[PDB]
Design a binder for this molecule. Structure first.
Ligand SMILES: O=C(O)c1ccc(-c2ccc(F)cc2)cc1
Ligand SMILES: [Ca+2]
Ligand SMILES: [Ca+2]
Ligand SMILES: [Ca+2]
Ligand SMILES: [Ca+2]
Ligand SMILES: [Ca+2]
Ligand SMILES: [Ca+2]
Ligand SMILES: [Ca+2]
Ligand SMILES: [Ca+2]
Ligand SMILES: [Ca+2]
Ligand SMILES: [Cl-]
Lengths: 359, 358
């Protein structure tokens, strides 16, 4: 096995394939004019292809991922990196820098089980990026309900939808993708969502998604990502969206966010409850803590409904306002014993639900 | 106690004073004559910020949670006027239609550092102190049982102020002229004091006034006064650590040398971090290997016309120096395989670095 490749042609591939010792190595394969690099953690896998325009010789080995990445990154910009197998070592040469790395046999590099694609679609990368970003923050972390440690991907009609919830707050985003789809849904593990997201530069290469019974695959240009799905049953987001919230408050996102952020300073550190009092075109936010410190914020907003009060966890609300990254926000209220739904005031494509607190 | 001050006049002061006994988490606020004073302390050191009060005010003192008050002021919008008043045992903070009520602890409970007398004094540009500290800070020990090494020596000699830092394995020294006839004197400033002192030099034309007592150092810049306790004990003599006659002189590009070491370091021992240097006529070779028998080799062109020699080093120590240096070329000054190396900017003798061989 031998190849010589420009440093910069290896850097993006190496970042994508980087995260038993062999799981800490990358499989390198020279075949039919192409260098393929594979990383895996047994739950998921990334394969990056690099075209080889300089002389090369076929073969395959595995090499420590972090050391090989760090050597390539540490070489000077535009360096040519000559790689050859020599006995049990992998030699890396560029200028008068030489490195001998240990290897493990390509034969021992683990593969995901073979599987069949059942559902497939193509969409712009920017659309997948939007879907994931809109909701990623609401996924559970290492919860006993293992099926919340990931993101639902649901096809229906011509829409792809993502749902994330940690059992307390929920995020949902739907986008039309211009293809008739089966009604189907799957759960992608947390780490898979994150790796998928990192693969997307949002650029001009179409993203092709293939879904099997127990696997998902995403293909963009020179990169192919494969993950196991979470084998479990996800909650129905339709049941948590409030029935008929008829009290809509609209305000500038940044003004609302800064008012909540100040008030939060004097909220309970553990449960983070703040109270809202809504009246004719006015919002008052209050917060207090066990030491009886108090905050109050009054803002002009757009609101015409009945007067009401509601409490909620300000961290959950701030998470939403931070995810939204839009000029104006709509808070869709019902009463003091019901959830609130929050949206970009200009778009229904993403919706967030936060539960009421009694304070 | 009442004052109203523009947000922009409070943020920097609050940052400067904010850095289990609860009162150490509070700031002392004092309105007296034309001035709001803000003090923060941890019993070892103290920062005092003065703010001129041009708007109506009323005298008095209290203490308030530092982080909460800072976070409130910072979170208010650009240009906010911040009206403050003590009401009972609460401090009220108002701006626009934002209102906050903070807990207080009595000003009478706020600890003072003991009074002391100034014995040595001098003034110097902020930039000179920045230079002195940044040149050496990285070489201080962290939690060494030789407590005198967890800090920085500040020495006056002739008209020079000098800093020295060492952890017993590598050493940094930097000396700068300050144009005043000084007594010969040394003190050790605790590492936390060094960090806080450094942080107060941000970062214009106000000069620094330094006062040194038997057990304290104070620094005055602009409207800020920093005071620290000193560290007892017998600091090593940098003149003993500097090689006596390191007459083998190698010159190389700083960034070239640094990146060669940084690559070699990848295949060095993860704990001991050892690399080898082979110096020969106008050439340097760096090698590294680890317990898995992985190997790195770097060869560089340098300017060297002395005898051949080899020497081993902790590469982290060398990288630390090269990253501190900020210059085009470096001079490495060698003695033999079992003696320290001295490293300097090729163009300036104002700082010197010494690394022990391994
Ligand atoms: O124990 C000490 O005080 C002590 C102080 C400094 C050194 C030392 C020796 C050689 C160096 F290159 C740096 C530092 C050793 C020991
Ligand atoms: Ca190439
Ligand atoms: Ca992987
Ligand atoms: Ca939706
Ligand atoms: Ca209030
Ligand atoms: Ca003012
Ligand atoms: Ca302090
Ligand atoms: Ca000097
Ligand atoms: Ca070699
Ligand atoms: Ca000797
Ligand atoms: Cl509250």
């Amino acid at each position: 096995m031998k190849f010589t490749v420009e440093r910069e042609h290896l850097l993006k591939p190496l970042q994508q394939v980087s995260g038993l010792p062999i799981l800490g190595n990358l499989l390198l394969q020279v075949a039919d004019g192409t260098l393929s690099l594979t990383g895996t953690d047994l739950e998921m896998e990334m394969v990056a292809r690099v075209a080889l325009v300089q002389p090369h010789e076929p073969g395959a080995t595995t090499v420590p991922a972090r050391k090989f990445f760090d050597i390539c990154r540490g070489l000077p910009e535009g360096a040519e990196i000559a790689v050859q197998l020599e006995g049990e070592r992998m030699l890396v040469r560029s200028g008068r820098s030489r490195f001998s790395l240990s290897t493990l046999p390509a034969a021992d590099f683990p593969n995901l089980d073979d599987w069949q694609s059942e559902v497939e679609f193509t969409l712009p990368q920017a659309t997948m990026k939007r879907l994931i970003e809109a909701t990623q923050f609401s996924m559970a972390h290492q919860d006993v309900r293992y099926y919340l440690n990931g993101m639902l991907f649901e096809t229906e009609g011509e829409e792809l939808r993502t749902v994330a919830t940690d059992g307390h707050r929920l995020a949902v985003c739907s986008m039309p993708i211009g293809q008739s789809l089966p009604s189907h849904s799957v759960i992608v593990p947390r780490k898979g969502v994150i790796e998928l997201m990192r693969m997307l530069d949002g650029g001009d290469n179409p993203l092709r998604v293939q879904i099997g019974s127990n696997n998902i695959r995403a293909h963009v240009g020179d990169f192919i990502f494969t993950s196991k799905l979470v084998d479990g049953r996800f909650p129905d987001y339709r049941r948590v969206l409030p029935k008929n919230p008829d009290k809509h408050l609209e305000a500038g996102c940044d003004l609302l966010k800064q008012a909540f952020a100040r008030a939060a300073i004097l909220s309970n550190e553990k449960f983070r409850g703040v109270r809202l009092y809504v009246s004719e075109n006015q919002l008052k936010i209050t917060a207090n803590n066990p030491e009886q410190e108090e905050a109050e914020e009054i803002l002009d907003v757009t609101y015409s409904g009945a007067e009401m009060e509601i409490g909620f966890n300000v961290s959950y609300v701030l998470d939403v306002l931070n995810a939204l990254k839009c000029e104006n926000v709509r808070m869709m209220l019902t009463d003091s014993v019901s959830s609130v739904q929050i949206e970009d005031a200009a778009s229904q494509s993403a919706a967030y639900v936060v539960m009421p607190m009694r304070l």
